[PDB]
Paper text:
[name] plays an important role on skin and mucosal surfaces under homeostatic and inflammatory conditions, particularly through the recruitment of proinflammatory IL17-producing T-cells to sites of inflammation. In human and mouse, [name] is exclusively activated by the chemokine [name], which is known to interact only with CCR67.
Following imaging and data processing, a cryo-EM reconstruction with a resolution of 3.3 Å was obtained, which exhibited well-resolved side-chain density particularly around [name], allowing confident model building from Y27 to C336 of the GPCR. Notably, [name] binds to a shallow extracellular pocket of [name], in contrast to the deep agonist-binding sites observed in other class A GPCRs. [name] binds to the endogenous pocket located at the extracellular side of [name], making substantial interactions with all three ECLs. In addition, the N-terminal residues Y27 to L38 from [name] wrap onto the globular core of [name], serving as another critical docking site for chemokine binding. The N terminus of [name] is stapled to ECL3 via a highly conserved disulfide bond (C36Nt-C288ECL3), which provides additional binding surface for [name]. The α-amino group of the N-terminal alanine is likely protonated at physiological pH17, which may allow a salt bridge to form with the carboxylate of E19845.51.
Residue numbers in the entry:
A (entry chain S): 2 to 121, 125 to 235
B (entry chain C): 1 to 66
C (entry chain B): 3 to 340
D (entry chain Y): 8 to 63
E (entry chain A): 5 to 51, 182 to 231, 242 to 354
F (entry chain R): 27 to 336
The structure:
């Protein structure tokens, strides 16, 4: 598996540019695809999405009518065309794959991301900024929701992501309880209704990063503020 | 419907008006092919004539009333 | 010494015939009096699955008891979600003629074998998107009848070569071979503790093997035709055999005799499939006259009739928690009952 | 031929070393087992439309 | 009616639509079952081995031949799978007469069956010139000893063809018997002709005619 | 006065006295047996929707085109008896209108069945190869047949009215609107002649020639009965239809003459009732022959009879 994307540098304000994300090492035809932004001193936020077979398209509230998305199945490439750029789109842009059927893990693999610069709903809150830590101790991260994310079916739609310093963020936990493949057996997840908890047991070195909280109940996908673990 | 009685020929001699009491008008619009003026005399006959000749027009006027 | 060995075989057959006769104090039909009857049973068709364009031959539930598998002659293998009734996976098959298919208890693997004398393992949950073939095991001489996943690295397979063997999926070689029978083996069934299995063949007999040892212990002979279907009792101390002369039998293991027969004077055609209920008080049986009967398992009388398909009932399965029954047939539609 | 005979002789020997119980005991056990578990069987005794996971 | 449950439904309709396109594509093929005795020149006619499946194309039409050899089990048990096949192609060798009685009973077995009521047959007699060479010295009274006819070739073959028609006791089943000459005869044409009548005959039943 | 046997009105009182007793009984008898004959076929098909296909769908549509036609029929036997149209203007505009659609629709389904059987046998090998003929297609063609039947019948609805030509009230088309009266009559007469007799005649003879041509060369034991059915169906159509369409021409030939004699008109008068019934005889007999000759239909009819009766 390898997702690499390129194109974009510094532009003139109110211009235009294209972003190209080229995939290799899997069946591109089958998966859906997202675009996700990250401002230089802020958290993550959603942008756009296209389904498999180009059947359904959705955009964000902020960028509706200004940006456009398209895929090329024969050559395995994803395009994002953006026109009349304002002075608050200065951010990295990530390229994320996902799949939907009974018992699967969306947002499993992320891209590397390109730096673009421009020269001049469900509300979710994490009541933490920096949490003091020590190795060989158990800790707890708390994400509180606005309304209950439980549907008629038993399953609750809540995901937990981790970002290490100077790298791409990865999936830890999907659908609240279930654990992602390749992740160790130290992490555990619990919660009921609108209050949730991520519990870590015997934390060790190379396990400190910004932990993010995301819901997948309604479009558009809102993220958390993020929790930092110190040295 | 069907089998509607029609007048085929026109050809006749002129008839002095005193042998005429009653008359009708055959229509080319409805039932038959041609249009004509049938004449009923005291003897139970059924004389016919084309509508445009002077005598048929002269008698039909005078015997329109009484 | 052929005449000497021929009598030594006879004298022992005369002894075993007098052992089984001197054990029977009474029949079950005497002891099963003074109990309340089941009373008329009735079930309606809850759901119908459509997509296949040819005869359905096999199917299997999963331990989850929400997802199931099925196979047909068109060369496709579909995985259904029984609740929302939508397709999860549809796999293109290599050779068109398939007879059997299995589903692993972990829910990570699928098997299927046909008239190519080859059994193919398919790996679900790959790192990349698509499904592919994990391993292929071909060591048999005749067509494959049945196959059952013992574990994620152990599978049992019977054939029309009049033998069955145990495989190791990781190395892809035969571990042990079982040789007793003299006719084509039609079906087999695992015990609840995955220690013992029994098979039934076209010499009108059934045998009981030992997986870890590799020898037959007992042989049960009570039919007059080819045995088609076989199934263990939930307790794991009895089984029931379906045959091609419109009769089902009930055998015991601790006592070596046959304990009961099930037959009606109307029906005159062979049985294709048998299966027990969760408590094991009902016994379902598929016939080839477009009809599926429901027998009482102690009184030995009919307790109900499931509504007919357009063509022959080939395969039926009861689920683990025991909520539903599912049946397939040659008119290419699946139906779920309750 | 001798191989098939010498196998079949030793096969019939092993089948004659089994210890058997009466039909009465093996009968009462199956009847005893069924009575205990039959009370929570969903096909025998129908569950209502509340807990039925197929309709409602 | 959920975010994920709607995407899962969209995937199902994509699968549903995909396999029906293959269903239409696989209905434009002629399936043929190739039975007969072994060492009967079966290979020339086509122009732990489980099953050999061949394909050719002639005059813009796709043929599929399924040969069942080296199985050695109980036929009836696995003849259910080949229940509908456009036709059957049976092969016999006149070279040796001591495999005639075996081949004749075998034909009689397949001809009158539960599943093959209306399925018509094509019957190829091979090694034509080889049979007609050894009719000189070795008389025809060795097989079918009750009667033969004239000593020489031309009116002998008639007697065998008569036995195979006598074995047919079906009300509405045709047998298109042709003769093959050595290992240098065009047979694709002979089949193409025989296949046509079977399609015409099936369409007449479908129509108001007959 | 002195005029003798020249241009005298032609009395058609006698020709209608013959008609008074003859017309009602013929309609009444073929109505009952016609309705009884067809309703059987409509029920037998309705038993199993499953396995219905191709020629069966066209046969089912024909059976429907016969029931309505013969259900509409008895109101004119009541009119011929009474001898005065008592029913409302809307009745004369409806009953004459619908009857035209049912008759016109009946013929375009026969030419469909003919072209269906052509593709089936002559191009059997090619039709199998391309999958040319499928079940859903037929339903589109049926809608197109019903489409044209509405359009062609339009000219009938427009001109049909209620008025009193002679004696008591009658139900006839009246041309008061147009400029040229006889040209529109000649157009409306000619329109029915072409679609009635000339479209079907050419389509049948072409198809049923090239079917028989290839079917005599084929080697089979089923080709014998097939030819006997074809010839019989072709023979009947000619024996029933020809007389009326000849009489209908004789009308068109002299619809503007004045010298024409009465004896000629009187003779055409009688035979127009006698030749008119044979068109209704064929229309009510046709679908009963087509289906009942079929082997599969006859077997399934016996199946239901021997199962339901017990």
């Amino acid at each position: 598996v390898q997702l690499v994307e390129s194109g974009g540098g510094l532009v003139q304000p109110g211009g235009s540019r294209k972003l190209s994300c080229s995939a290799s090492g899997f069946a591109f035809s089958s998966f859906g695809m997202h675009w996700v932004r990250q401002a230089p001193e802020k958290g993550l936020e959603w942008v756009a999405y296209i389904s498999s077979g180009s059947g359904t398209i959705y955009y964000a509230d902020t960028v509706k009518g200004r940006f456009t998305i398209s895929r090329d199945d024969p050559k395995n490439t994803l395009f994002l065309q953006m026109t009349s750029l304002r002075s608050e789109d200065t951010a990295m842009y990530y390229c994320v794959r996902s799949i939907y059927y009974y018992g699967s893990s969306p947002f499993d693999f992320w891209g590397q991301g390109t730096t673009l610069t421009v020269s001049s709903d469900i509300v979710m809150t994490q009541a933490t900024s920096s949490v003091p830590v020590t190795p060989g101790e158990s800790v707890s991260i708390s994400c509180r929701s606005s309304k209950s994310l439980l549907h008629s079916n038993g399953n609750t739609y809540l995901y937990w992501f981790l970002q290490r310093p100077g790298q791409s963020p990865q999936l830890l936990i999907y659908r609240m309880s279930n654990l992602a493949s390749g992740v160790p057996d130290r992490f555990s997840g619990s919660g009921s209704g609108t209050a949730f908890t991520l519990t870590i047991s015997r934390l060790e070195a190379e396990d400190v990063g910004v932990y993010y909280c995301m819901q997948h109940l309604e479009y558009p996908l809102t993220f958390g503020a993020g929790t930092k673990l110190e040295l | 419907a069907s089998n509607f009685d029609c007048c085929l020929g026109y050809t006749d001699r002129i008839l002095h008006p005193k042998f005429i009491v009653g008359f009708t008008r055959q229509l080319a619009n409805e039932g038959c092919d041609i249009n004509a003026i049938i004449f009923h005399t005291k003897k139970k006959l059924s004389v016919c004539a084309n509508p445009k000749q002077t005598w048929v027009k002269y008698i039909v006027r005078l015997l329109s009333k009484k | 010494e052929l005449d000497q060995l021929r009598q030594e075989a006879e004298q022992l057959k005369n002894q075993i015939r007098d052992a089984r006769k001197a054990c029977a104090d009474a029949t079950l039909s005497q002891i099963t009096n003074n109990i309340d009857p089941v009373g008329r049973i009735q079930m309606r068709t809850r759901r119908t699955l459509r997509g296949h364009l040819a005869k359905i031959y096999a199917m299997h539930w999963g331990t989850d008891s929400r997802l199931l598998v099925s196979a047909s002659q068109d060369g496709k293998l579909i995985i259904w979600d029984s609740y929302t009734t939508n397709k999860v996976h549809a796999i293109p098959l290599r050779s068109s003629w398939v007879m059997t298919c299995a589903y692993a208890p972990s829910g990570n693997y699928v098997a299927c074998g046909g008239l190519d004398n080859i059994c193919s393992i398919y790996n679900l949950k790959t790192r990349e998107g698509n499904v592919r073939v994990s391993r292929e095991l071909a060591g048999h001489t005749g067509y494959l009848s049945c196959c059952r996943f013992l574990d994620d690295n152990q599978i049992v397979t019977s054939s029309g070569d009049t033998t069955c063997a145990l495989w190791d999926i990781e190395t892809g070689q035969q571990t042990t071979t079982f040789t007793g029978h003299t006719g084509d083996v039609m079906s087999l069934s695992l015990a609840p503790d995955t220690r013992l299995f029994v098979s039934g063949a076209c010499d009108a007999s059934a045998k009981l093997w030992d997986v870890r040892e590799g020898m037959c212990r007992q042989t049960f002979t009570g039919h007059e035709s080819d045995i088609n279907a076989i199934c263990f009792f939930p307790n794991g101390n009895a089984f029931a055999t379906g045959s091609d002369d419109a009769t089902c039998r009930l055998f015991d293991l601790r006592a070596d005799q046959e304990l009961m027969t099930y037959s009606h004077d109307n029906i005159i055609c062979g049985i294709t499939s048998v299966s027990f209920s969760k408590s094991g008080r009902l016994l379902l049986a598929g016939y080839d006259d477009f009809n599926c009967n429901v027998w009482d398992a102690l009184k030995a009388d009919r307790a109900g009739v499931l509504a007919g398909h357009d063509n022959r009932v080939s395969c039926l399965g009861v689920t683990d928690d025991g909520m539903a029954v599912a049946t397939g047939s040659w008119d290419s539609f699946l139906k779920i009952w309750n | 031929s001798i191989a098939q005979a010498r196998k079949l002789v030793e096969q019939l020997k092993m089948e004659a070393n089994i210890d058997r119980i009466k039909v009465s005991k093996a009968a009462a056990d199956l009847m005893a087992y069924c009575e205990a578990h039959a009370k929570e069987d969903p096909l025998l005794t129908p569950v209502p439309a509340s807990e039925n996971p197929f309709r409602e | 009616l959920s975010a994920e449950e709607r995407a899962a439904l969209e995937r199902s309709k994509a699968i549903e639509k995909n396999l029906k396109e293959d269903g239409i594509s696989a209905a434009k093929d002629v399936k043929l079952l190739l039975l007969g005795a072994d060492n009967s020149g079966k290979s020339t006619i086509v122009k732990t081995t489980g099953i050999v499946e061949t394909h050719f194309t002639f005059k813009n039409l796709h043929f599929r031949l399924f040969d069942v050899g080296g199985q050695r089990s109980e036929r009836k048990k696995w003849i259910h799978c080949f229940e509908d096949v456009t036709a059957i192609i049976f092969c016999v060798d006149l070279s040796d007469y001591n495999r005639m009685h075996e081949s004749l009973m075998d034909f009689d077995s397949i001809c009158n069956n539960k599943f093959f009521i209306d399925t018509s047959i094509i019957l190829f007699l091979n090694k034509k010139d080889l049979f007609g060479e050894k009719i000189k010295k070795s008389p025809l009274t060795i097989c079918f000893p009750e009667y033969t006819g004239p000593n020489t070739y031309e009116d002998a073959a008639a007697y065998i063809q008569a036995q195979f028609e006598s074995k047919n006791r079906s009300p509405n089943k045709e047998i298109y018997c042709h003769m093959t000459c050595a290992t240098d005869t065009n047979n694709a044409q002979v089949i193409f002709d025989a296949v046509t009548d079977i399609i015409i005959a099936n369409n007449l039943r479908g129509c108001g005619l007959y | 006065y002195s005029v003798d046997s020249e241009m005298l009105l032609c009395s058609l009182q006698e020709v209608r006295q013959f008609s008074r007793l003859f017309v009602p009984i013929a309609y009444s008898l073929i109505c009952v047996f016609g309705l009884l004959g067809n309703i059987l076929v409509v029920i037998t098909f309705a038993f199993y929707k499953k396995a219905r296909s191709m020629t069966d769908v066209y046969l089912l549509n024909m059976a429907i085109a016969d029931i309505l036609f013969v259900l509409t029929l008895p109101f004119w036997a009541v009119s011929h008896a009474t001898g005065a149209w008592v029913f409302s203007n809307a009745t004369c505009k409806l009953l004459k209108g619908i009857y035209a659609i049912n008759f016109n629709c009946g013929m375009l389904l026969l030419t469909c069945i003919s072209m269906d059987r052509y593709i089936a046998i002559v191009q059997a090998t090619k039709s199998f190869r391309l999958r040319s003929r499928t079940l859903p297609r037929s339903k589109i063609i049926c809608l197109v047949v019903w489409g044209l039947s509405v359009i062609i019948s339009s000219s009938t609805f427009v001109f049909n009215q209620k008025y009193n030509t002679q004696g008591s009230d009658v139900c006839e088309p009246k041309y008061q609107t147009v400029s040229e009266p006889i040209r529109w009559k000649l157009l409306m007469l000619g329109l029915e002649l072409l679609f009635g007799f000339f479209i079907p005649l050419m389509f049948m003879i072409f198809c049923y020639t090239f079917i028989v041509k290839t079917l005599v060369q084929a080697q089979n034991s089923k080709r014998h009965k097939a030819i006997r059915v074809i010839i019989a169906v072709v023979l009947v159509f000619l024996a029933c239809q020809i007389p009326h369409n000849m009489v209908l021409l004789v009308t068109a030939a002299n619809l503007g003459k004045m010298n024409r004699s009465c004896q000629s008109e009187k003779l055409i008068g009688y035979t127009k009732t006698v030749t008119e019934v044979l068109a209704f005889l064929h229309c009510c007999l046709n679908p009963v022959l087509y289906a009942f000759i079929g082997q599969k239909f006859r077997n399934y009819f016996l199946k239901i009879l021997k199962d339901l009766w017990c």
